[PDB]
Amino acid sequence: GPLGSMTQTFSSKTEWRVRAISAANLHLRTNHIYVSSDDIKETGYTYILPKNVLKKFICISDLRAQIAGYLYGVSPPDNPQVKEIRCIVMVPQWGTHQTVHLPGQLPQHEYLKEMEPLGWIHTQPNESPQLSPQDVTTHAKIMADNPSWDGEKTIIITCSFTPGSCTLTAYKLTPSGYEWGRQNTDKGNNPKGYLPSHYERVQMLLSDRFLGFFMVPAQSSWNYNFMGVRHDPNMKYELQLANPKEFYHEVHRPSHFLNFALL
Amino acid sequence: LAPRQVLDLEDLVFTQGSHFMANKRCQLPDGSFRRQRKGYEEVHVPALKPKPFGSEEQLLPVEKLPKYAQAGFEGFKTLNRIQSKLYRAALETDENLLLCAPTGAGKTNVALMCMLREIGKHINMDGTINVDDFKIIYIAPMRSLVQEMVGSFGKRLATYGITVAELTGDHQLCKEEISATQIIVCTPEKWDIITRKGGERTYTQLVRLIILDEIHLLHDDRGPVLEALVARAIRNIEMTQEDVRLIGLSATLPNYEDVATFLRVDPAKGLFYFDNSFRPVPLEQTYVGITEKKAIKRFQIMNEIVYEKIMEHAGKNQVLVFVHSRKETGKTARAIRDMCLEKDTLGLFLREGSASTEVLRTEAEQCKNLELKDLLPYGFAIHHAGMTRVDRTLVEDLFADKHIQVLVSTATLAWGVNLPAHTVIIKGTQVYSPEKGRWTELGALDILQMLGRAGRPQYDTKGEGILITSHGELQYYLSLLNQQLPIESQMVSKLPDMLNAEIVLGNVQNAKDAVNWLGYAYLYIRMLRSPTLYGISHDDLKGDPLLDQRRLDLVHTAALMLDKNNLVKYDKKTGNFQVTELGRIASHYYITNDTVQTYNQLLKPTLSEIELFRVFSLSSEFKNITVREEEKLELQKLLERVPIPVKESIEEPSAKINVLLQAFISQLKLEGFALMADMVYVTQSAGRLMRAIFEIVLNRGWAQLTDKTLNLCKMIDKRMWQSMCPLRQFRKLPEEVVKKIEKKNFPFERLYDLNHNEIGELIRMPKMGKTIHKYVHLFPKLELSVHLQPITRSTLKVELTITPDFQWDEKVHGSSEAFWILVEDVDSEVILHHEYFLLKAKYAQDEHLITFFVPVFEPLPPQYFIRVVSDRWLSCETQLPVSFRHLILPEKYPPPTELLDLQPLPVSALRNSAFESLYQDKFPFFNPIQTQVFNTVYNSDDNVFVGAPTGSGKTICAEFAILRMLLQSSEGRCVYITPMEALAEQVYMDWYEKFQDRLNKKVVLLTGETSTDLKLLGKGNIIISTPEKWDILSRRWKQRKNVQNINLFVVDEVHLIGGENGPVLEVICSRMRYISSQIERPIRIVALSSSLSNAKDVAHWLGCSATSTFNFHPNVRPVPLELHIQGFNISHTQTRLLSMAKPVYHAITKHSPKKPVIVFVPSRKQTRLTAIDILTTCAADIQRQRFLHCTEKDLIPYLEKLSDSTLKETLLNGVGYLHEGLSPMERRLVEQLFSSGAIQVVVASRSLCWGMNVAAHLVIIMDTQYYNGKIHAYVDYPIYDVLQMVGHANRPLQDDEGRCVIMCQGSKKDFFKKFLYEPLPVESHLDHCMHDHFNAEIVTKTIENKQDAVDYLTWTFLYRRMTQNPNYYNLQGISHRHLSDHLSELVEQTLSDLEQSKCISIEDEMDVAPLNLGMIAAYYYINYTTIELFSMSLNAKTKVRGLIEIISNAAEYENIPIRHHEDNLLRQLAQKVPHKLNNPKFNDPHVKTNLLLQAHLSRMQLSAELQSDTEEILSKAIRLIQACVDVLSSNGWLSPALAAMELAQMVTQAMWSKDSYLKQLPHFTSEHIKRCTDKGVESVFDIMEMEDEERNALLQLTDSQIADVARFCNRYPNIELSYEVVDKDSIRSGGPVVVLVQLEREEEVTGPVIAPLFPQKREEGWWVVIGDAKSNSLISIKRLTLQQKAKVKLDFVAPATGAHNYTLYFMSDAYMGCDQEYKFSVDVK
Ligand SMILES: NS(=O)(=O)c1cccc(O)c1
Ligand SMILES: NS(=O)(=O)c1cccc(O)c1
């Protein structure tokens, strides 16, 4: 062994570069979107998700850090059992591979006043045969702070990155689920009291028949995964009618640009 | 042609570029010798003796020059030697020239002499220079040279008024200076890129002289740019017949005679060669060739040679050393100065007893350049580009003042400053070329320039040039500096790129063209003269003596390269070349063809910044960039941290290039010399490469990528990322404070709401809150708003209002600020629409209105978006969401009226032999539409609507109604309205034939003259009129019973209510319905129209019962119409038209090979061009002259009568054309040849689509946009024009079908399909055009209050459409109360405007009444704004010039045609105008109107289309003058009123006040009136009262012209005038003064006024005026028309008692000389 005869010099290879290159190719998956229909029968309403905003949601996402959008919609005049998702709202947020961090404050905009809240959609690195206990906790605590979320009406759509594609599956909480989730302070993967009888799958269908839209923050962007210190559960935000920027867009990571010029 | 061979261009390239040496031997001048030394050879060449003075060649005194050129030689006594030899050729001839001479021998002053010759062609008689008539291009290789030339030429030419200027970098925005620049100085590349673009209304056509300086650059890798320029110039001379003089200035090198051939220089006249003995100061040359190969030893040998050579001059001569790096200047000066220190030799440069040491000490102390600090005290200095301007000036002054003794510099000083030195040393000839990626030899031009600096012209007896190089280069440099390095063509390497440029321009359309074009290249000349040099056997040349085959092979190979790379579609059989958008972008952005292949292959809409940077880095411009091992670690550092990740390894040049770009944007300092030169080379071109990418993806509609790419352009330009505070873009702001701001990370937008206090607080630096506040509101910023206007359920019109929301400041915003308007879809993925928006400084405070169409669908999408983003500022953008949640779509249009299959109706159905004689010879049966509507039209009195495609024969349906009317009333009156005057004329001819000749009724055409037209209305049974003539007539319907007793009212082309002139049509129709409801005997209305989606609305508005509205849709045209729409995905107009040229011909041979074809083109010039192009394509085809169907001899008589040569040629080959600038006889000849079948094709301009009397089997519409010069932008054809054009493809009596091909920009295709395959929706625009109509109705008491105005509106089409399409009229509901509120607001705004304009009075905010001004505006039919402006301008002291000015600024002239060709014309027309005004102002229609009026009064000249322009101006001049007369009279001003009254006479007879009345008589001129005044005759009665025999000798006489003279003299007014004052011996003050005035004419009312130079036929008007000249007081006035005898009564109120004498005035409005003047004076008693 050599102390100086074979000296070599470490060279940094930062983590986000690889994930940025990976996020650039996400558009390839928007043409292989599969909805899990595994539930033999349906419990709840039937939720219809327009492809256009689903594709944008996938495209603005990251393969590891979860992102989330709030779902707003209405029932078609015909039958109240169908819930058409009309809008996805992106709010200031950060996340890990397991969970998302959203502000306490729900979306508030006049443009949304004639629609009802339907829950939320979020990405996941891997398919799971079960709804996450983090997700149950998150949905339950939102319901506990916001009586406009009816447990028989608000859902969680998971968008999991299967290789080459995306798999969507939709859940709703059960009353036992809400009661456990709202008192759960264990953020791990196997918390005490977690039960598969805390959620149940709902029927979901992708559509091209109509188009949804996005709302985004009025002065910030939505992605705070690079500004984590600046994000706070109690932060307030307004909204505007515009489309969201992609995960690695320059306005989401300004320190990468200002720091490089300091070399 | 066919046996072509594919060459390998790269194997024909001279790789050494300008270092290629074609000569094998080099002959040294006598006395040269070689000495050997350790490691190097020296070659000395002695200085030449100047040549003897020939044969008394004497130096020319400036006095002997032409005097207009002497000012350009102010401050000189005598030309130098070379100028004296060149004076005759340069100044006395226009010969192309080539001057070869040693550098600095005088070539520039010869170029000045050529420029002076050109300037002389534009010297006026007043001594001034026309400056707008011409342009001169001076092409120089280096930019620093360009700047010095701007300086020196500008100073030499200032005294002439000449502006000299460098061509600026942002051509897309700044061309305003180019219009004021007579001498443009620039590089070859800039001139190439400018002539490469079309440019629309360019200035390149004014270029009369091109100077090509340092033309031996031909031998450089840049040489092909010069070959491109010259080839293009000479071929363009051929295809314009407008000469351009070419002047070449060259070093003395072999092949100058071939260069002369290439410039088309006659060797016997324009070729001058001066050998190196003409160097201003002789040159002793020393060449040092180092044999040592080992690098370190070679560099030390170099420094030793330099030191020893310096020592031969230390203290004796200044020495200027040239090195080839900025850092190397300092390194070399330090090497030498330290060698001098060690050897105790520093003292030889600065001795004692000279204050120079002190000057150097003090100027080095305060210099602040550290290398300059270390060096200046020792007498050493450096000079390079990265230095302060005043520090470079310090070096230059100190060297000129002889303080510096050793100066180390780069090439820049040799090219940019005039700083010679006794001794010059070139230290090494190796330089790093990033483009080559390697070290290479210095270019020859650089070497020549540097050595040209040796020897100061008037201080040195000789110069000493020492050149140090490697031994193997000695012969090369020995050749270059001793007249022996031949100039060769470097062109084959650039052949494909150059070829593409000519293809994109349309100069080359096939291989034969390209062979022709290559024949003008310098390459061709050299290939002919030295074939083996260019790869051609001497046997091959003797078998191909013009090198036709060799050129075809070269063109073939280049064409295949371009076709492979998708720049061009190349058809090998034909050899045809089709342009592409990719090809055009490669040419216009100066991109090599491989690069656009790469861009096309890799650009996708889904690209990220990552892949964008990689795509850019793959550009072929960087193909030689490599990654050197010594660069790796440094690059590695940056690559581990770049903000845009790089996918590929640092092994790859692509990654180094990417990292260099990102580093340049982040403004990072790098250390490796290779890396820094490479970064410069990469980023210098990044700008235009990224703009090319931007144009590609923008025109593809890729919203995301368009955003990223425009952003990257701006980051490259501003050298910062988006993440940085946009305040950084104000360079004046301190970087420290903007960094302080950046640190707080808050949004920039929030700065707009705080104030200077709060901003100073948030920055934590309050000291300058105010300052930052200021800059915040200087940052460009726009507010956006929309009015959504549904057209259908799938097409939406958008009106965008752009309100600027920032303070303008010229020092930050210049004179304009450019933006892109981008309409993006639901997902911000597709650009639905986009256009460039320019905010000029003069409109910086004004709202701007933009209107466009976008598709929409059902169910409606949530929203679209309108982004407006700056074209140059980062973070400067506004996005407005356009939500559709409350968009009210119109109802889906109803089904058409079914076409019932009826037995064709025979003519005999009219049951009237007289009536049947109108059609029985023409056809046996009526078409299905006529058959279907006949019963209703002919056998009932119902109002009728007939909607059907143009060409369905709706005119015959109108005739059915007229015949029924003739049966009901022997003196029935039908009024027929059609919207265009040309249609009115055609209908008048046909209907005169039918109803006057064959039925013996009275058919009349309204002229526009009220008295004439009232007569025509009384006497006529069929009255044909355009809308406005009927509007002025029918406003007075209450007092005009012939307007009420109208039996039948027919309105044709009623769909035009929706067009630009629709409001007047809608009003007259509404008025006819209102009158019919008032008079209790109804007036039948028949409306004819193109197919209408909302036909039922029109019918109900006009009172048509459903059973009598026939709403036929386009599928029912009697001649079936086959319509094809071809989209062209090319967004540059001239390129798109080019790509349409051959498709026009193919469409002919496909859809109408034998039958008549009309081609509509957008402009006058294009008619000629496209006629020629059709002919050219014909001759290349097997079928030539296939479009001529009569003998040449049967056509020759027709031909000779024309004045256009091209027109006679094209006609001879079977193709006519039609534009506005042809004589009306020429138009008639072409149209008759077309209807005869003699000529098969006619190319007409769009403007003629309404006045053509020909039809065709096939109509081709070649593009659908035209250039508006007033607004400097392209405008879409109105759909109405397009429907009319399509309607020309219709021949019921000859064809089974009509065919039309519409060629349009691709973005327009869907729109045409929507509004041509289906019926058209029309809307009212009356709500934008009400003031004049409301005003008129208040004059006639139809509207007496606001409630009346609402009820008025209830009769209109506007009111009907407000309920059917509320959003179109900015209503948000259809409730009755919503409509009432809307009408009330419209009424309120319109009445308020009129009241503020003083046209009406409003009492109790309820009742309205007309004011004098409103009554005048209504009576004369004048825009109320015109009358208000008159009221402001007229001033009781107005002179006839002020009158012409005021009336030329009337609103009625702002739509007079504008074409900037006339601009120059116009700028000369203002030169001689007798009357004076303040400012000549470009091309506003008002100044063209004033100018054409000037040219009318003094019959200046005979223009062409401006003649019709003058006629249109004269159509309104008289009413404007009469309005002025009424204004002045109503204000009591006598002299201005009489002035305007004479101005009416002036305009009528085309004279001035101080002209001879005899000018009115026919066949007279100036000498006649001068000799009549010479014999005592200055009045028309003077010439009348004399015997005929004498009169005939008095004037130059023709007998049969005397008969027209006599018709005039008998028509001239001869009125004898009586007048009494009515019982005024008993007059009282303040009471009645009544004057009776009788006029008796002998017998002169045979017809109209004789005024042949006036377009309208007029009747004589008169004014009787009572006035007092003392106080200039108009007392009484009456207007009258006289018919042999008539009396008039004038009223006045007695003002005071006694001493009152009043002048009576009798004033004509038509003739001069017959005004009368009397006096009367009764007293108050
Ligand atoms: N300035 S130029 O070389 O003669 C030129 C070339 C091409 C087109 C033009 O209109 C003018
Ligand atoms: N260009 S569009 O009308 O807004 C559109 C249509 C269909 C799907 C989309 O995602 C977007």
Ligand SMILES: NS(=O)(=O)c1cccc(O)c1
């Ligand atoms: N028909 S278009 O709008 O001008 C167009 C479409 C696609 C590419 C282009 O370069 C241009």
